Ligand binder design. Structure first.
Ligand SMILES: [N]S(=O)(=O)[N][C]C1234B567B89%10B%11%12%13B85%14B%1158B%12%11%15B%139%12B%1061B%12%112C5%153B%14874
Ligand SMILES: [Zn+2]
Length: 258
């Protein structure tokens, strides 16, 4: 009986194995745009993905992960609220069964069709496993997806999903450029939070871009053809793999923009 997104193992059950689910800095959250305050102390955000080296794409039974070589500083996030250098390790998405749901963060209670998480770790801690044990160990760049025009830089991902339909399947995925998944604007909201999946560790500086990217109906439909189950098991479509908004508690969301 492991964790997932169903009635019997979903978000409302996670706290039994992972008591930090009811912690003081859980993610995601609703971003109330009128309560978020512009912060002049924020430095410019630097997304440096030119040298990124993708390796593989994996269906882990919860989402698909595009993994990167993070054995040197090649694709890095710095600036904004961050002190130091954070290395890109992987990205993945959360999405819905319908276009009106799928994001984890919400904006004035609005749910987007999906949300992209680019996961980075603070190089001062030497490895990802050490980083997740620290309050400032990770920086996750969150980008909302809405349905409209196709995102050309997403299509290479979309076209490999056939090869990784079921839990445990992986495919080589070299030379993928994550720059093609970014919107024009780097305007963002930031707050201290957590991983939104077990182990729900309170180790993340969240940076959520205000500008969504647009993807086509056909693109998101292909996400929805993935499977939570393993090969030769009854088919359970990989949809609605999002955690809902959690209590903000003693936190302020800061805006990079006026
Ligand atoms: N939505 S999230 O990025 O907070 N958490 C997803 C994951 B998957 B697995 B590792 B990988 B890295 B860590 B565990 B799980 B946690 C981050 B990725
Ligand atoms: Zn995520």
């Amino acid at each position: 009986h492991h964790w997932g997104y169903g009635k019997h193992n979903g978000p409302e059950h996670w706290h039994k194995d992972f008591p930090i689910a009811k912690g003081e800095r859980q993610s995601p959250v609703d971003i109330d745009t009128h309560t978020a305050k512009y912060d002049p102390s924020l430095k410019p955000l630097s997304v440096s993905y030119d040298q990124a080296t993708s390796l593989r794409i994996l269906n882990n039974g919860h989402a698909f992960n595009v993994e990167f070589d993070d054995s040197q500083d090649k694709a890095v996030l710095k600036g904004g609220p961050l002190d130091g250098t954070y290395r890109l390790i992987q990205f993945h998405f959360h999405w819905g069964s319908l276009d009106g749901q799928g994001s984890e963060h919400t904006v004035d209670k609005k749910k987007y069709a999906a949300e992209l998480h680019l996961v980075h770790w603070n190089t001062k801690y030497g490895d990802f496993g050490k980083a997740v044990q620290q309050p400032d160990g990770l920086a996750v760049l969150g980008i909302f997806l809405k349905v409209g025009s196709a995102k050309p830089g997403l299509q290479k991902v979309v076209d490999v999903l056939d090869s990784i339909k079921t839990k445990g399947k992986s495919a080589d995925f070299t030379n993928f450029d994550p720059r093609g998944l970014l919107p024009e604007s780097l305007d963002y909201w930031t707050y201290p939070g957590s991983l939104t999946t077990p182990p729900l560790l309170e180790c993340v500086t969240w940076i959520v871009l205000k500008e969504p990217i647009s993807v086509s109906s056909e693109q998101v439909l292909k996400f929805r053809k993935l499977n939570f189950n393993g090969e030769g098991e009854p088919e359970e479509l990989m949809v609605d793999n999002w955690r809902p908004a959690q209590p903000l508690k003693n936190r302020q969301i800061k805006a990079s923009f006026k």
